[PDB]
Amino acid sequence: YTIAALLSPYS
């Protein structure tokens, strides 16, 4: 299967 994940950390 195909899965996309996006994580953008902020301070």
Swiss-Prot record:
Subcellular location: Secreted
Tissue: Detected in serum and cerebrospinal fluid (at protein level). Highly expressed in the choroid plexus. Detected at lower levels in the liver.
Similarity remark: Belongs to the transthyretin family.
Function, as annotated: Thyroid hormone-binding protein. Probably transports thyroxine from the bloodstream to the brain.
Other noteworthy facts: This protein binds retinol-binding protein at levels similar to, and the thyroid hormones at levels much higher than, the human protein. Tetramer dissociation and partial unfolding leads to the formation of aggregates and amyloid fibrils. Small molecules that occupy at least one of the thyroid hormone binding sites stabilize the tetramer, and thereby stabilize the native state and protect against misfolding and the formation of amyloid fibrils.
Quaternary structure and partners: Homotetramer. Dimer of dimers. In the homotetramer, subunits assemble around a central channel that can accommodate two ligand molecules. Interacts with RBP4.
Annotated protein name in UniProt: Transthyretin
Gene: Ttr
Shown segment, full-protein numbering: 125 to 135 of 147
